[PDB]
Design a protein around this ligand. Sequence first.
Ligand SMILES: [Mg+2]
Ligand SMILES: [Mg+2]
Ligand SMILES: [Mg+2]
Lengths: 152, 152
Amino acid sequence: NTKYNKEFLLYLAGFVDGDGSIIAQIKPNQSYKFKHQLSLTFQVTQKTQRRWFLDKLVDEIGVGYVRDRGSVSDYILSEIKPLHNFLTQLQPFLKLKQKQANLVLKIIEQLPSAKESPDKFLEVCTWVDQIAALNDSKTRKTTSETVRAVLD
Amino acid sequence: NTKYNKEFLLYLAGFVDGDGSIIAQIKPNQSYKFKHQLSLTFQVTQKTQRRWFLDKLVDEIGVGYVRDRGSVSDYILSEIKPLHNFLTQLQPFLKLKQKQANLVLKIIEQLPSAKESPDKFLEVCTWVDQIAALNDSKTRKTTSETVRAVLD
DNA sequence: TCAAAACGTCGTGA
DNA sequence: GACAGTTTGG
DNA sequence: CCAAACTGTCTCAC
DNA sequence: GACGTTTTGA
Ligand SMILES: [Mg+2]
Ligand SMILES: [Mg+2]
Ligand SMILES: [Mg+2]
């Protein structure tokens, strides 16, 4: 469980607040018990000409990867354990996205317990609803209310 | 002549690298001896719903102001003396915009010299060219060579 | 004749 | 920036 | 059944 | 984000 230097986190927290995104998602998939996946992503987006900055991030955070879409790239961190360790440390330095971050940690910690009850799975889906409410979200489709219907 | 806190600077450098802009412009203006003004701007842009963040910048930096344009607002610092002092302290923490910041610092120092000599004035204009070359620049119009013409 | 503020908008890079 | 829909392989 | 990866795009907020 | 044009005020 990696310790990150505070100088790294202060800078990163400011950059993340600007160009980064903290994302909670409910993805319909029929292979899943509740017929949806809970997905959690930390990402930093940057123009591909600046990709080196994202590649350095991978080296610094020590986990995650960069993905290319044309003129733009993203650092992506998905795996739950590293994500928790990293967001825990970054959270206190965030200003704009700090609420989002603390909710993700909550969703993560409750994730096992949410695969039992349709009820707890919903309670956690409303937290997703919350993170989306904080983000500037124009494109969203699947919500805790989507899940609600399906479960009935 | 304010000394800024290092934690404040580290975070802000990150944010600036993400959402900020270090801008140099040659503004054609007929009231000027060389028929152009040399203009420097440090800005941070954010959605107006987040304007509180920008307001806190004014308080923290101690100088500058917030402007509104539609759905979006900007922290603006154009005052050359405060600007020099601020950027001098921010620059070593900048990863993406550090060269721009240094060019600005160099322009500000050389500005009195620029106002005497058309040759020196043109020289400083080439430094602003180099800032635009570093920024993701699209709508740029007036350049050092545009100035050179008018001078002849 | 200047420094700074005020106002306005393209082309993305988030 | 913040999603979407789809595939993979234990 | 699941975590995680892979792949694509809409509407801005820079 | 990164420019543009125009006006203000010593
Ligand atoms: Mg931003
Ligand atoms: Mg941005
Ligand atoms: Mg950026």
